[PDB]
Amino acid sequence: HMLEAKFEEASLFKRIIDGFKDCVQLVNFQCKEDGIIAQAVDDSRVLLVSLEIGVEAFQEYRCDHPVTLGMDLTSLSKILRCGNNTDTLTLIADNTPDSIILLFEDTKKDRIAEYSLKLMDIDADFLKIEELQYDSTLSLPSSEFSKIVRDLSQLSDSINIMITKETIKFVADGDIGSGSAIIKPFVDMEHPETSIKLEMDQPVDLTFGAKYLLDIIKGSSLSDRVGIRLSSEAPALFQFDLKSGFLQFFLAPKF
Amino acid sequence: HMLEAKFEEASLFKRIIDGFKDCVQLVNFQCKEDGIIAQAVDDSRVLLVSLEIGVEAFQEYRCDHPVTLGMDLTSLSKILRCGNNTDTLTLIADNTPDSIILLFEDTKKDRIAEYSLKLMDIDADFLKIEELQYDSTLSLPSSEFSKIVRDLSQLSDSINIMITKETIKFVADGDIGSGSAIIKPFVDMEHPETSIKLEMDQPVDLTFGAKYLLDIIKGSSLSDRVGIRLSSEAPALFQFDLKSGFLQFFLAPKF
Amino acid sequence: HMLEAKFEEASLFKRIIDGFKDCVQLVNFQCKEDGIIAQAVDDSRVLLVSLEIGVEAFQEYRCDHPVTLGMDLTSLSKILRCGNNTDTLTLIADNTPDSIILLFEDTKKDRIAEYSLKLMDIDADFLKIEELQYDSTLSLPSSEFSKIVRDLSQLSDSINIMITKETIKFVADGDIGSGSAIIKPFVDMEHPETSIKLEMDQPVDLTFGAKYLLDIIKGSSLSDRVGIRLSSEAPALFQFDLKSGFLQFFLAPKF
């Protein structure tokens, strides 16, 4: 009992985990003094999940020692289905820990639920694959992006994002036919968060697997907007902005 | 780009397809100058689905050429799950078409989704099996008819509709037991659409498969009332009245 | 047509059956002059379900003859999915019956649905295993008890209820980790039905199967509170208080 990180609402940490729990299985939660960060590469080694949770995301955070505690998402999510969404979730562990302790407590002092989670042993191959300059950079409503991905997934397992100047084009092409959703950058004032931005330095023609994109758009529940950075050189970066933190999805193109 | 039929709301065409998509698989959409009509016989050749969609059902309809464009329901329904229920769905095709183009556009000009559907090749065995005079003719609330069919389906796979004068009797008889729902014709004034009519010229004792009836009652979402015409000679006619059009289910009795 | 028991709402009898239909399969409904009682032991012979339905639970009850009519829950529940929740459900049978008749009728006289259920032949091994004195006796909100059982079921198939003085402790221990929910007896005044009582005569350390507890907590829909009596000698008694009646779950501990 030494780091005891504490969330205001247990739902918040649950929503964060639920955002990327489907695309991966094992995760290396590397928590330190300035907060918690984590990475997780899937089995096929084509999708990286990078997470950062700052101090301000907690209502009371402490960590007198850099502790790397990896664990299974399926096991972690099971314990996360025990709270009452508004309970006080406290992540407790000690120096060189065997298990992480999750403490659920409501506003009243009737319910005091304490859970233990046997920690996994994960290799420390941390990746830094974010580029300085991307060929194209765009940001759109997360709910809108989920719509495009889900609709095109009906047609084929290959969604081709094609970006030219002032033209963002999503195209799917399968056996039963094809589909094409085309959006253009604009500005709104009644609700400026529905706006679409585009900063193209060079035209982009990349192809991504539909299987992976469907898991990526599940982070729409964490942010209203999604930042997409496309490059012909490095994997694409799908970023969801959290309150004092972020959830990144690095996806490698096909072909 | 020559016929371009256009719906006010994309939901309407989706609801129509959803009304009969389960009981069949391939459909021959025979659209012409006065609107669109279609037929579909299942594999077992005991259930016919006849559809008619008049000009008034569209908000803007054109067709300078009688075009028969058949297609797969499963593939068609997939594309129909892309709209936003209130988008402008436009069915576009050309003379001697390879594929039918479905264009989704909302009120604003942000979303312009265009889909292509590879057309099937369906045989032109169109059937006209509607009789002049049926032994019995009745009409009841569609939601009420769905209740009777669903409840009796629990007991056995054979639902026997038995009609005598002023007595409409639905009977199921299986291994675990039996059930009998009996309704009588009457008139209401607070909401005359809940009334039950019956025009019996001759008593009817027909037996239908529960499997088929369950698919037939799925058209209750298209009309408040359902018209049933029973004959000992020809297949029974279950008819749902659309706004400027209809959805018919011709079902052959057992034994 | 001789006993014709009658419920005010068909939903009530449906909810009662739905309370214990999952943990067993065959049930011996032994109805008599003062009401209806029934017992059902599962295949593994470790869980007994005892039911009592008094006269006051019906809106109109009669029974001129003690009749034991056993039946299959699955078949009984099927027929129970036919009503409209507010219909007049009437259980009809005769002296030495072959089948039990279930009559559904609404407030209006349009719907008159009559169902027959072929009665099963069940052995008359009725059990009286309730003790006089139990080591511990407690009562808590049924919704709260369901929460504890469901959450701990995620961890292992063995939930250990551990009771000491003024301390009720639920513990699960599995491969991925463990969990512990600890509640203490108190009194509320805004809503005294959320209170927790405990009358310990002797400390209790019993282990129950999670499979069975999950079925037991399904009776939370019948009562706000659940009475639990634990004994080291006899099976534990989980009791849900009905309006003029009860639903009991006798569960044998492990090890």
Author numbering:
A (entry chain A), B (entry chain A), C (entry chain A): 0 to 254
Task: Reproduce the article's own wording on this structure.
Proliferating cell nuclear antigen (PCNA) is a protein that is essential for many DNA metabolic processes including DNA replication, base excision repair, nucleotide excision repair, mismatch repair, and recombination. PCNA is a ring-shaped homo-trimer that acts as a sliding clamp that encircles DNA forming a scaffold for binding numerous proteins involved in DNA metabolism. The subunit interface of PCNA is comprised of two anti-parallel β strands: strand I1 (residues 109 to 117) in domain 1 of one subunit and strand D2 (residues 175 to 183) in domain 2 of the adjacent subunit.
We first measured the growth rate of these 17 strains in liquid media. The Y114F, S115V, and V180A mutants, which had a slower growth rate in this assay, showed no growth defect in the spotting assay. Six of these strains (Y114A, Y114F, S115E, G178L, V180A, and I181R) had the same increased level of UV sensitivity as the K164R control strain. By contrast, all 17 strains, except the S177G, S179A, and V180A mutant strains, had statistically significant defects in the rate of UV-induced mutagenesis (with p values less than 0.05). A defect in UV-induced mutagenesis is a characteristic indicator of a defect in error-prone TLS.
